[PDB]
C-alpha cells in the first residue's frame, strides 16, 4: 500500500500513455514525459516535451503539451464557463483553472500548448461550448473576442474571466489563452486501461490482461515512491529494460496511419505523421455533413485519393481507425484483399483501443444466415447484426424507402449480437467470406445493387469492406440517431 498520484490511477493511466511514445520509434521528436504527483499545480499532472518541436495548426512549432487533469470522477458531470475561474473545481482551495494557466503562460516557453483533460461534458447551451473547438479543443479566439462590449453574449465571459485575473483589457485575456485547450468527455478510467495495453503492445512492451488489478497503476506509484518524475527516451528505455516489460525490442515495422471522422483528442493525434493522417472532421472545420450526397461526393474522393497514395508506397500498414461505419467499410474497400497490402488495425472509440490481426486464428461456428423475400426487385439487402439486432430497422427503412430491393440476408454471429460477439481479426474475416458467398450464390444481376446494413465495430467493418470487391455494385448506409429519435438508416456511399 503506497501513497497514490493527486490524480490516482487516471494520472497514472494518462502518463503511461505519454511516456509510451518515448519508445515508439514513428514518434522519435518525444524528447522527455514527466509527471507530478503533489499536486495539482500548474498544468504539469503531464508534460510531453518534443525536440524537434512538434507540428502544430497554428503558426509556430510546439515545444510542449502541459496537461492539468481534472480528478477523475466515474459519474461524469457538466461545466461550463463560470466554472473556469472556481479553484474546487480543479479540487482545490486556491487558484482555479485560468490562475493556473495565467501562471503557466508566465513561466513556460512561448510556443507551449496547454490543455484541460477531463471526462466531464460541457453544458449544452453554455457559453463554453462555443468557444471552444470540435476539432482540437483549442479555444476560439476569433469566436470569443467578438469586438463588442461587456454587454453581449462573449462579454460575459470576457468580463467574467479578464475580472477574474485582474487583467485590464480583453486583449491581454487573449493573450493569456492563447494556447489553451479543453479537452472534455475524454476516456473513461477502464478505456484508459485498454488503451495503456494498446500503446505498450504497440511498442512492444508487455501487456496487463484479464487481472482485476492493473499492474501499471502500482508501477507509477513504485516509480513515485523512488522519486522518478520524468524520462527521456534512454531512461524510459532503461526503465522498460529494469522492469522485464519489454517483450519485443524490434516488433514488425509497420507504416502508421490514421483516418479519423470525429474530435482529435491530443492523446490520438499524433498516431501517424501528417502525410499519413486524414482526419475528416478537422477538413469539415468541425462540422460534419449529413450522412448522403457529400459523402460521395466529397468525402469518398478524399479517402479513395488518401488511401490510393498509401497503397502504392506502403506493404504494411498499422491503420488508426476512429471514423463512421461505412468510412471504415469504404476504407476496408480502399485497401482490400486485391491490394497487397499486410494490415494491422487499431481500433479506437469511446469503448476504448483494441489491435485487429489476422495473425491469431479461429474456430468458431458459422453464422446464422436467415434470407427473407420482400419483394419482386432485383436488389438485395445484406443486414448484419454484430453489435445488436439491426434487421428490424433495417426492414423497416427497406419497406419504406427500397421498392427495388426483393431479398433481405440477415447475418448474425452464432452465439448472437453484443458487443464482444466477434472474436478476432480471423473471425471477422471468416463472417466476410461466408456472407460474400452467400452473396454471389444469389446470383444478383450486374444492374442490381447490393445495399450493405451494418451494426458493428470499425474494424469488422474494415474487413467487410475489405470484401465488397467481390459483390459488384455496393451501396453502404449510416445509422442515425436524428431523423427519428430512435435512429433511422440513411445511404452513403455508392460503390
Ligand atoms: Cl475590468
Redesign the pocket.
Known amino acids: 500500500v503506497l501513497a497514490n498520484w493527486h490524480g490516482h490511477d487516471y494520472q497514472a493511466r494518462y502518463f503511461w500513455i505519454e511516456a509510451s511514445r518515448l519508445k515508439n520509434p514513428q514518434q522519435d521528436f518525444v524528447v522527455e514525459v514527466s509527471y507530478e504527483a503533489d499536486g495539482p499545480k500548474a498544468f504539469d499532472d503531464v508534460i510531453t516535451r518534443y525536440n524537434p518541436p512538434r507540428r502544430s495548426t497554428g503558426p509556430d512549432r510546439i515545444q510542449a503539451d502541459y496537461y492539468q487533469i481534472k480528478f477523475h470522477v466515474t459519474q461524469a458531470a457538466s461545466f461550463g464557463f463560470e466554472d473556469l475561474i472556481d479553484p474546487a473545481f480543479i479540487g482545490a482551495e486556491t487558484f482555479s483553472i485560468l490562475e493556473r494557466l495565467k501562471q503557466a503562460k508566465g513561466t513556460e516557453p512561448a510556443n507551449s500548448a496547454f490543455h484541460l483533460v477531463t471526462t466531464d461534458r460541457i453544458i449544452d447551451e453554455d457559453p463554453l461550448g462555443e468557444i471552444i473547438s470540435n476539432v482540437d479543443g483549442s479555444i476560439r479566439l476569433d469566436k470569443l473576442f467578438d469586438g463588442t462590449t ?1 454587454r453581449s453574449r462573449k462579454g460575459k465571459v470576457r ?1 467574467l474571466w ?2 477574474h485575473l485582474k ?2 483589457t480583453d486583449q491581454e485575456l487573449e493573450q493569456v489563452l492563447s494556447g489553451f485547450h479543453i479537452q472534455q468527455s475524454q476516456p473513461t478510467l477502464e478505456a484508459m486501461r485498454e488503451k495503456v495495453n494498446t500503446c505498450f503492445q504497440i511498442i512492444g512492451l508487455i501487456t496487463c490482461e484479464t487481472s482485476s488489478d492493473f499492474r501499471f497503476d502500482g508501477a507509477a506509484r513504485a516509480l513515485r515512491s523512488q522519486e522518478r518524475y520524468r524520462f527521456t527516451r534512454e531512461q524510459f528505455t532503461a526503465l522498460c529494460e529494469e522492469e522485464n516489460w519489454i517483450r519485443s525490442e524490434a516488433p514488425e515495422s509497420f507504416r502508421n496511419v490514421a483516418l479519423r471522422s470525429f474530435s482529435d483528442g491530443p492523446l490520438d493525434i499524433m498516431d501517424a505523421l501528417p502525410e499519413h493522417t486524414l482526419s475528416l472532421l478537422s477538413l469539415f472545420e468541425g462540422r460534419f455533413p449529413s450522412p448522403g450526397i457529400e459523402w460521395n461526393d466529397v468525402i469518398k474522393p478524399q479517402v479513395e485519393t488518401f488511401l490510393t497514395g498509401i497503397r502504392q508506397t506502403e506493404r504494411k500498414v498499422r491503420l488508426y481507425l476512429n471514423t463512421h461505419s461505412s468510412i471504415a467499410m469504404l476504407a476496408g474497400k480502399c485497401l482490400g484483399h486485391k491490394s497487397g497490402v499486410e494490415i494491422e488495425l487499431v481500433q479506437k472509440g469511446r469503448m476504448g483501443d483494441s489491435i485487429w490481426s489476422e495473425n491469431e486464428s479461429q474456430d468458431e461456428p458459422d453464422a446464422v444466415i436467415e434470407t427473407e423475400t420482400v419483394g419482386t426487385g432485383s436488389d438485395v439487402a445484406v443486414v448484419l447484426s454484430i453489435t445488436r439486432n439491426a434487421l428490424p430497422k433495417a426492414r423497416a427503412y427497406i419497406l419504406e424507402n427500397q421498392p427495388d430491393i426483393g431479398r433481405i440476408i440477415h447475418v448474425t454471429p452464432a452465439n448472437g449480437h453484443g458487443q464482444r460477439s466477434v472474436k478476432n481479426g480471423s473471425h471477422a474475416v471468416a463472417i466476410a467470406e461466408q456472407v460474400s458467398d452467400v452473396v454471389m450464390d444469389a446470383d444478383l444481376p450486374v444492374e442490381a445493387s447490393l445495399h450493405i446494413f451494418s451494426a458493428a465495430p470499425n474494424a469488422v467493418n474494415f474487413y467487410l469492406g475489405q470484401h465488397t470487391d467481390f459483390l459488384g455494385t455496393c451501396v453502404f448506409y449510416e445509422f442515425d440517431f436524428q431523423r427519428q429519435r430512435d435512429g433511422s438508416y440513411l445511404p452513403s456511399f455508392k460503390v
Open positions: 461587456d468580463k479578464r475580472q487583467l485590464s
